[PDB]
Amino acid sequence: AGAALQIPFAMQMAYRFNGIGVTQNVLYENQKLIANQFNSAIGKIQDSL
Amino acid sequence: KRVDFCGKGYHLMSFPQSAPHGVVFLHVTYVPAQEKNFTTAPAICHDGKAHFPREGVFVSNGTHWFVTQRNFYEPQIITTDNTFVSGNCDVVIGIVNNTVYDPLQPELD
Ligand SMILES: *[C@@H]1O[C@H](CO)[C@@H](O[C@@H]2O[C@H](CO)[C@@H](O)[C@H](O)[C@H]2NC(C)=O)[C@H](O)[C@H]1NC(C)=O
Numbered sequence: 001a002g003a004a005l006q007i008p009f010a011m012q013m014a015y016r017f018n019g020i021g022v023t024q025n026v027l028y029e030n031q032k033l034i035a036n037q038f039n040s041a042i043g044k045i046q047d048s049l
Numbered sequence: 050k051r052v053d054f055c056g057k058g059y060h061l062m063s064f065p066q067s068a069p070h071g072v073v074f075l076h077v078t079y080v081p082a083q084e085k086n087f088t089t090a091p092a093i094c095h096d097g098k099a100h101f102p103r104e105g106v107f108v109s110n111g112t113h114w115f116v117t118q119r120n121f122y123e124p125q126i127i128t129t130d131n132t133f134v135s136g137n138c139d140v141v142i143g144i145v146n147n148t149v150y151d152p153l154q155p156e157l158d
């Protein structure tokens with residue numbers, strides 16, 4: 001929508017969770033588990049392809 | 050609400066106009082500019098508890114901490130009604146020490 005505005009990644013995932021109804025309190029207390037989920041899922045999709 | 054469907058940027062409205070064998074839309078759109086730089090933090094620790102913003106974001110110009118909305122700049126002092134508490138802050142990453150003002154105490158004096 002205009003000029004790029006820098007933003008830390010975690011504070012962007014917090015906005016994206018607020019976007020779907022889950023409060024942002026959930027993300028900051030479960031960050032490591034979500035990171036591991038993400039990495040494992042991307043590894044599995046790489047292997048599947 | 051879908052982005053880039055009508056215009057470039059956030060959308061306000063549109064006006065139609067005729068043509069020989071077609072239609073012409075005039076889209077009115079909103080575009081921000083004249084940015085700044087700020088230092089942030091995902092929460093605030095006070096009295097052993099963690100406070101998160103209701104709707105907004107934490108900013109700091111070096112020595113003071115404020116809460117502002119995302120798309121515009123208008124600082125407000127951190128009260129205890131626009132921030133909500135959740136648990137204790139020993140597992141969150143990025144917490145910052147500070148003090149949070151409350152409105153009831155001065156009015157009780
Ligand atoms: C950050 O902004 C605050 C808010 O303006 C500055 O603190 C105020 O400075 C003015 C004069 O410069 C004083 O009259 C106020 O008493 C200060 N406090 C408040 C709460 O308004 C502060 O100097 C700024 N710091 C930097 C590094 O820019």
Ligand SMILES: *[C@@H]1O[C@H](CO)[C@@H](O[C@@H]2O[C@H](CO)[C@@H](O)[C@H](O)[C@H]2NC(C)=O)[C@H](O)[C@H]1NC(C)=O
Nearest residue numbers: 008009010088089090091092141142143144145
């Ligand atoms: C932002 O990043 C910097 C550097 O990537 C972090 O600073 C590091 O903090 C750890 C402590 O957790 C130290 O062990 C490192 O030595 C620091 N790095 C450097 C280069 O000094 C900083 O903690 C990060 N901020 C947040 C909020 O996560």
Ligand SMILES: *[C@@H]1O[C@H](CO)[C@@H](O[C@@H]2O[C@H](CO)[C@@H](O)[C@H](O)[C@H]2NC(C)=O)[C@H](O)[C@H]1NC(C)=O
Nearest residue numbers: 093094095096097138139142143144145146147
């Ligand atoms: C924020 O304040 C807390 C509490 O004052 C600090 O944590 C203590 O720091 C002192 C000295 O650095 C230690 O002796 C204590 O063991 C710490 N824990 C407790 C429970 O008192 C903390 O270092 C400050 N800074 C940050 C970034 O949290």
